[PDB]
């Protein structure tokens, strides 16, 4: 059994072991970190099965659960949040902090995204690129979901940059364990603060919602708030990141596309579509144990036995997806949908506010900087490393 997470085949492609194992052995048996054997489902369907079968657990403290690092096995023993629940507890607890990221609430959110990314746009003109190239990830596709999530939240104005720049530390590929932990600390030591202070005072944000609503009441106490509050913020953060670098990236690989971009930006939700299918930079969360035996396509699963589906495999299935390892913003989409946000009741949480977000960029980026280039040779753009969920680290543009 091959080793397991399977490297990139290169930068910007997932794992070559995919392609093969959806034509020959569709349900696999990996080897993880430390050893153990767990099934890896790789085609659309099987995908979506795993996702919302009720006899598969997210339980991390049931027997057989595929954690792929040392550190997961560890973080497995804190008290868990939603994201690592089962029904009925899932939902009693999403329920709580569901309501700010509904379609109904995101709409409403999207002047102060538009906002915002106008903002961090103006600045970047502003600072300007006459002395070299800027770093398209640290002036622009970082802050800017931060800046958001962290204001949903509760964080004030004048804490943004600091915390931005913590919680990048805590994901940054060339920090030591010690920087990692310390910036960590520093973003549950903050979140714990503002949770007593909006005890006191609630105003309106996500983290007054959930001392008003749920703490005070004594349905969870604080320190679930901060869990909470912690989970909201570092899902997704580093992925959204990775989104907008990957988007530019993707963008200056398709001439072609962009250029149809730049004359039409009403097609930025199609091109978001495409790229949540095509850049799959999660790839790596829909992972269960079983709780009685299944049958996944002509494999049988033994109870307390981990199963990994590969939504990113899942999102270049030949049989879904015609042509699925083109690039094609303006593809006709068949009825099953894209997996980049996963599937089943633990779908992302934030997929409508996600995609509001990379639509607000993709329609106003190019419109303000008509001219932006990535400045490196596409050949040399520094991705993240081969075996981690793809993204690109830095990205230095003109304009
Ligand atoms: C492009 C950006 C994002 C992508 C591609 C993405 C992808 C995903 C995926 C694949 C899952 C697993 C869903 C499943 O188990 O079926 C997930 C879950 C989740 N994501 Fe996202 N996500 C993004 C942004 C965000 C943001 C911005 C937030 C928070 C504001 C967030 C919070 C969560 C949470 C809390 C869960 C757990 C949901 C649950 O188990 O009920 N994500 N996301």
Known sequence: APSFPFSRASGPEPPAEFAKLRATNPVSQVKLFDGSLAWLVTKHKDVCFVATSEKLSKVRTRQGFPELSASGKQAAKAKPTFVDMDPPEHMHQRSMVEPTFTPEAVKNLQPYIQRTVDDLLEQMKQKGCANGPVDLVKEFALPVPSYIIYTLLGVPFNDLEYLTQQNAIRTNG?????????????????????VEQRLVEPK???????????????????????????????????????????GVATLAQHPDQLAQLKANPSLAPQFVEELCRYHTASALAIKRTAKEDVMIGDKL????????????????????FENPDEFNMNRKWPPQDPLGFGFGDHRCIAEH????????????????????????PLGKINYTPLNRDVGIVDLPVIF
């Open 204 to 246: 309106d944000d996500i983290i007054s919602k959930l001392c008003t609503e749920q703490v005070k009441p004594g349905n969870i106490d604080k320190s679930d708030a901060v869990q909470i509050a912690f989970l909201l913020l570092v899902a997704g953060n580093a992925t959204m990141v990775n989104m907008i670098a990957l």
């Open 353 to 376: 506010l996600a995609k509001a977000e990379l639509t607000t960029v993709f329609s106003t980026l190019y419109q303000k900087f008509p001219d932006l280039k990535v400045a490196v």
């Open 174 to 194: 060339s920090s030591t364990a010690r920087e990692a932990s310390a910036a960590n600390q520093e973003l549950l030591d903050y979140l714990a603060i503002l």
């Open 301 to 320: 699963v033994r109870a307390n036995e981990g199963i990994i589906a590969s939504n990113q495999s899942a999102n270049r299935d030949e049989e879904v």
